[PDB]
Design a protein around this nucleic acid. Structure first.
Ligand SMILES: [Mg+2]
Ligand SMILES: [Mg+2]
Ligand SMILES: [Mg+2]
Ligand SMILES: [Mg+2]
Ligand SMILES: [Mg+2]
Ligand SMILES: [Mg+2]
Ligand SMILES: [Mg+2]
Ligand SMILES: [Mg+2]
Ligand SMILES: [Mg+2]
Ligand SMILES: [Mg+2]
Ligand SMILES: [Mg+2]
Ligand SMILES: [Mg+2]
Ligand SMILES: [Mg+2]
Ligand SMILES: [Mg+2]
Ligand SMILES: [Mg+2]
Ligand SMILES: [Mg+2]
Ligand SMILES: [Mg+2]
Ligand SMILES: [Mg+2]
Ligand SMILES: [Mg+2]
Ligand SMILES: [Mg+2]
Ligand SMILES: [Mg+2]
Ligand SMILES: [Mg+2]
Ligand SMILES: [Mg+2]
Ligand SMILES: [Mg+2]
Ligand SMILES: [Mg+2]
Ligand SMILES: [Mg+2]
Ligand SMILES: [Mg+2]
Ligand SMILES: [Mg+2]
Ligand SMILES: [Mg+2]
Ligand SMILES: [Mg+2]
Ligand SMILES: [Mg+2]
Ligand SMILES: [Mg+2]
Ligand SMILES: [Mg+2]
Ligand SMILES: [Mg+2]
Ligand SMILES: [Mg+2]
Ligand SMILES: [Mg+2]
Ligand SMILES: [Mg+2]
Ligand SMILES: [Mg+2]
Ligand SMILES: [Mg+2]
Ligand SMILES: [Mg+2]
Ligand SMILES: [Mg+2]
Ligand SMILES: [Mg+2]
Ligand SMILES: [Mg+2]
Ligand SMILES: [Mg+2]
Ligand SMILES: [Mg+2]
Ligand SMILES: [Mg+2]
Ligand SMILES: [Mg+2]
Ligand SMILES: [Mg+2]
Ligand SMILES: [Mg+2]
Ligand SMILES: [Mg+2]
Ligand SMILES: [Mg+2]
Ligand SMILES: [Mg+2]
Ligand SMILES: [Mg+2]
Ligand SMILES: [Mg+2]
Ligand SMILES: [Mg+2]
Ligand SMILES: [Mg+2]
Ligand SMILES: [Mg+2]
Ligand SMILES: [Mg+2]
Ligand SMILES: [Mg+2]
Ligand SMILES: [Mg+2]
Ligand SMILES: [Mg+2]
Ligand SMILES: [Mg+2]
Ligand SMILES: [Mg+2]
Ligand SMILES: [Mg+2]
Ligand SMILES: [Mg+2]
Ligand SMILES: [Mg+2]
Ligand SMILES: [Mg+2]
Ligand SMILES: [Mg+2]
Ligand SMILES: [Mg+2]
Ligand SMILES: [Mg+2]
Ligand SMILES: [Mg+2]
Ligand SMILES: [Mg+2]
Ligand SMILES: [Mg+2]
Ligand SMILES: [Mg+2]
Ligand SMILES: [Mg+2]
Ligand SMILES: [Mg+2]
Ligand SMILES: [Mg+2]
Ligand SMILES: [Mg+2]
Ligand SMILES: [Mg+2]
Ligand SMILES: [Mg+2]
Ligand SMILES: [Mg+2]
Ligand SMILES: [Mg+2]
Lengths: 114, 88, 70, 101, 271
RNA sequence: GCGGUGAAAUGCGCAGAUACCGGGAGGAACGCCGAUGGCGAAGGCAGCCACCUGGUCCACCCGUGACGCUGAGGCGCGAAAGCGUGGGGAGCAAACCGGAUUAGAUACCCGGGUAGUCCACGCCCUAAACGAUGCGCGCUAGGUCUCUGGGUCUCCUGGGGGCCGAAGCUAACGCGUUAAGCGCGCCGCCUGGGGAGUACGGCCGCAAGGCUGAAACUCAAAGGAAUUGACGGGGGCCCGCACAAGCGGUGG
RNA sequence: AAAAUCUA
């Protein structure tokens, strides 16, 4: 909500789209971004370049709140998984640390058609 | 399972002489105990069926033993069936 | 790289509380490491993992820990 | 009669009085269902891996009794009744197998 | 389960009746201070207020201890399991060692000659009874109170039960037989377990008269009547509804919440 | 804005969705170990704990003394789907509705979604119920991998799981101490294709439907493995003004 | 996502 130096950054990277969001050290988001906030539509939203622009825009929004350092956390295996990180490198924000945390079942929920 | 002591209490009773751990009647009674216990086991585990197969095979084995015993000598058979209370 | 068995001497693999021995088997993910990396026998590996799950239930061992930087 | 190891985790954040209080109840149930105790050991407080009852810590006990094989189920159930009692796990004891001889 | 009948007559090939195996042998009810007279077919003004009640068969009302807490700590022996023509559930004669005999709604799986008690000290185990704030969360329960010290009124029918979902302040949460979740005061007593005669539902009345024996009178369709006597009273050649289906007095039957809105007790319910 | 796809649309979201955190409800299923792995007569069987229980194998060289094998009918088991009575219901998902694709699309793809999938008891009893190989015993080269048991253990000796292969067999393919080899015992079953697992009778079942089970008739073939070639919106290497890059043309 | 057919 308010203004903080340290914080976190989540990456929801699906196949049809990759979106990201910055948050306070607690868990409550400050601002966010996606392929859609870049104006792209369709498979253009899942594009790695779009993930780059989305992460850069998200960083640009985070810097407005005075964010400087951020612990990053990733999820999913979308075609923009690494580009979030890559954009967050020279984003102007301290990368501090990177963590994978892709949710995965121990076989329980039956999958869709595929 | 069954106790070793409980096993000996039977073996000693059915033996024709001490150390007869394998005689016909010995095996018949010995199997009959397991037939009874397993039968009672099925009386609460109706779902269980493999155990029930084992029961069928045990009963069959016992019946073969009774075949040979009855064929060899009907008198010792006459005593054994009476002491184990079968056929009816 | 390194076989896990050579790290420690003789020990109880059935013991489900010697966490300092059992921890060296799950890597930075909590994954029950494959037999080809721990270098154990079948009989050994099986009851090892079986006691491992027990240790997981007690809150001693972790089910799945988040991987670090990648 | 069968050799059994019993593991019981309890609330890490409570006074020693409540600790001994619950321990007493454990003793009670044990004697009540014919659990003749042996080498008992109090492992004390330890840091857990995953948070149990939204708590990263946990107190530990470790009995080792012998009793008729049946009620060892029901006994466990008795241990379940008390709210403060977190984990319960009875395990049939076995010979400590040897690794890396 | 249920007893059946060979079709040596129609209206009997379907008629089933519960096996009274759980009853301990007793035709005479505890003729002490438990039986009592009973009557009524319509309100105090001779008018009818409930349609289709009457006929029936004579019944001595068994007086039940629904407020079982006045004897705290005092144990009792499950003397008997009796029939009761006034409830779906079976009943249970318990002999308090105090000397006083009384009745309780018979819970499921209740052995005759069982130990049973009522108090906050009680062992959490079938038959016993105690305040809700003492029963471990996530337990079956029946014959629950509502407001404290006002007698049990929740779950008293055969097979019925409620589960405790959690605690909150001086209140506790129950999942009613209607599936409804609700706050009920912690001080309210309740008996642990579930109500017996679970096999009640499977009965088939079989024929007409069987209804009459229960007192249920013949029920005439609204659409069979005349426009004066009933809304649906079109009657002209098995005519369809005159739109839309509604009671003899006017209110629409299918889908119409009748629960008063600003009822205070609404502040304690959930779904 | 999300979601979704080959690209989209239907859908959801300023009535504040997506993404993130905390609190809680409920159901189904068991990640890593995990495997060419183990168990069972078959179907099948996977989190961990305890109780109950079957079958199975090693050692000792202890006991019984041919007590064995097969087994028509009978009897019990028998995936999934489906049926009954009463529960349960998160995910999935026939049917159905919508979107797209298309000449059409009652489909493949997408958004919704009910029986069902789950437990209790009871019925149904079919399958590519597959090793397409009935059971039991015995004789007939070795090499290697693996599960397990015993013994002072780079070896020796039992019991299972895979590959290569002596002889030999086979129509070829391929089998081959886990026979399709050489023998015996016994049960089941086949006699061209279609008609047809249909019809009638009988038995069973709540129904669906299952077990037995033909003929008239028609065809001069049906079928098995292998060879050769063409062929594929099969694969790999490779080529040509074939595409590409580029210059002018016709079609007007 | 596209390539439906080919009288004896
Ligand atoms: Mg997309
Ligand atoms: Mg895409
Ligand atoms: Mg993409
Ligand atoms: Mg998420
Ligand atoms: Mg998700
Ligand atoms: Mg999906
Ligand atoms: Mg014979
Ligand atoms: Mg008779
Ligand atoms: Mg031992
Ligand atoms: Mg009087
Ligand atoms: Mg009187
Ligand atoms: Mg009056
Ligand atoms: Mg009056
Ligand atoms: Mg009057
Ligand atoms: Mg009357
Ligand atoms: Mg008495
Ligand atoms: Mg519970
Ligand atoms: Mg009435
Ligand atoms: Mg009525
Ligand atoms: Mg009137
Ligand atoms: Mg009138
Ligand atoms: Mg009308
Ligand atoms: Mg009329
Ligand atoms: Mg009107
Ligand atoms: Mg309503
Ligand atoms: Mg009204
Ligand atoms: Mg009103
Ligand atoms: Mg529309
Ligand atoms: Mg939101
Ligand atoms: Mg949450
Ligand atoms: Mg936290
Ligand atoms: Mg549950
Ligand atoms: Mg077989
Ligand atoms: Mg066999
Ligand atoms: Mg066994
Ligand atoms: Mg046979
Ligand atoms: Mg089914
Ligand atoms: Mg149907
Ligand atoms: Mg459609
Ligand atoms: Mg077309
Ligand atoms: Mg169309
Ligand atoms: Mg057109
Ligand atoms: Mg059309
Ligand atoms: Mg239609
Ligand atoms: Mg059959
Ligand atoms: Mg066949
Ligand atoms: Mg064939
Ligand atoms: Mg060899
Ligand atoms: Mg060895
Ligand atoms: Mg030896
Ligand atoms: Mg050898
Ligand atoms: Mg030898
Ligand atoms: Mg030897
Ligand atoms: Mg060996
Ligand atoms: Mg082979
Ligand atoms: Mg082969
Ligand atoms: Mg071969
Ligand atoms: Mg040769
Ligand atoms: Mg030859
Ligand atoms: Mg070989
Ligand atoms: Mg023919
Ligand atoms: Mg034809
Ligand atoms: Mg034919
Ligand atoms: Mg048929
Ligand atoms: Mg027919
Ligand atoms: Mg005829
Ligand atoms: Mg006949
Ligand atoms: Mg059909
Ligand atoms: Mg059919
Ligand atoms: Mg014929
Ligand atoms: Mg004929
Ligand atoms: Mg061919
Ligand atoms: Mg060109
Ligand atoms: Mg030019
Ligand atoms: Mg020119
Ligand atoms: Mg031109
Ligand atoms: Mg020209
Ligand atoms: Mg021209
Ligand atoms: Mg055509
Ligand atoms: Mg044609
Ligand atoms: Mg042609
Ligand atoms: Mg034509």
């Amino acid at each position: 909500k308010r203004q903080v130096a340290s914080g976190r950054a989540y990456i929801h990277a699906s196949y049809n789209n990759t979106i990201v969001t910055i948050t306070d050290p607690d868990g409550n988001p400050i601002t966010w971004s996606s392929g859609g906030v870049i104006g792209y539509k369709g498979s253009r939203k899942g594009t790695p370049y779009a993930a780059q622009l989305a992460a850069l825009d998200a960083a640009k929004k985070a810097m407005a709140y005075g964010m400087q350092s951020v612990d990053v956390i990733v999820r999913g295996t979308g075609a923009g998984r690494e580009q979030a990180i890559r954009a967050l490198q020279a984003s102007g924000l301290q990368v501090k640390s990177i963590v994978d945390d892709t949710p995965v079942p121990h076989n329980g929920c039956r999958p869709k058609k595929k | 399972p069954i106790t070793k002591e409980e096993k000996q209490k039977v073996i000693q009773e059915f033996a024709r002489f001490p150390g007869d751990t394998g005689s016909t009647e010995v095996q018949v009674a010995l199997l009959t105990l397991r037939i009874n216990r397993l039968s009672e086991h099925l009386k609460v585990h109706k779902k269980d069926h493999h155990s029930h197969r084992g029961l069928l095979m045990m009963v069959g084995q016992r019946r073969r033993l009774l075949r040979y015993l009855q064929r060899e000598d009907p008198e010792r058979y006459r005593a054994l069936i009476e002491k184990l209370g079968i056929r009816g | 790289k390194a076989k896990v068995k050579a790290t420690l001497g003789e020990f109880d693999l059935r013991d489900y509380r010697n966490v300092e021995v059992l921890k060296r088997f799950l890597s930075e993910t909590g994954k029950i490491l494959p037999r080809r990396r721990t270098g154990l026998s079948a009989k050994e590996q099986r009851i090892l993992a079986k006691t491992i799950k027990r240790a997981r239930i007690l809150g001693l061992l972790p089910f799945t820990e988040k991987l670090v930087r990648k | 009669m069968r050799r059994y190891e019993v593991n019981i985790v309890l609330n890490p954040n409570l006074d020693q009085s409540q600790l001994a209080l619950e321990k007493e109840i454990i003793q009670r149930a044990l004697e009540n269902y014919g659990a003749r105790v042996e080498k008992v050991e109090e492992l004390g407080l330890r840091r857990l891996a995953y948070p149990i009852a939204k708590d990263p810590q946990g107190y530990f006990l470790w009995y080792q009794v012998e009793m008729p094989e049946d009620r060892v189920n029901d006994l466990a159930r008795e241990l379940r009744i008390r709210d403060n009692v977190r984990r319960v796990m009875v395990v049939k004891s076995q010979e400590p197998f040897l690794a890396n001889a | 389960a249920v007893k059946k009948f060979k079709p040596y007559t129609p209206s009997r090939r379907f008629m089933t009746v519960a096996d009274f195996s759980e009853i301990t042998k007793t035709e005479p009810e505890k003729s002490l201070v438990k039986p009592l007279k009973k009557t009524g077919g319509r309100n105090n003004q001779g008018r009818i207020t409930v349609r289709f009640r009457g006929g029936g068969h004579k019944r001595l009302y068994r007086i039940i201890d629904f407020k079982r807490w006045d004897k705290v700590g005092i144990p009792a022996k499950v003397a008997a399991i009796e029939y009761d023509p006034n409830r779906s559930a079976r009943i249970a004669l318990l002999h308090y060692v105090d000397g006083e005999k009384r009745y309780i709604i018979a819970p499921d799986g209740l052995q005759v000659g069982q130990q049973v008690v009522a108090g906050p000290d009680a062992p959490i185990q079938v038959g016993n009874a105690l305040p809700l704030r003492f029963i471990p969360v996530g337990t079956v329960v029946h014959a629950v109170e509502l407001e404290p010290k006002k007698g049990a009124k929740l779950a008293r029918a055969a097979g019925t039960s409620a589960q405790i979902q959690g605690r909150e302040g001086d209140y506790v949460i129950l999942r009613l037989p209607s599936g409804e979740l609700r706050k009920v005061h912690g001080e309210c007593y309740a008996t642990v377990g579930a109500v017996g005669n679970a096999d009640h539902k499977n009965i088939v009345l079989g024929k007409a008269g069987r209804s009459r024996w229960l007192g249920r009178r013949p029920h005439v369709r609204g659409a069979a009547m005349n426009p004066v006597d009933h809304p649906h009273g079109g009657g002209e050649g098995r005519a369809p509804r005159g739109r839309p289906p509604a009671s003899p007095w006017g209110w629409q039957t299918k889908g119409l919440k009748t629960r008063k809105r600003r009822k205070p007790s609404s502040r304690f319910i959930i779904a």
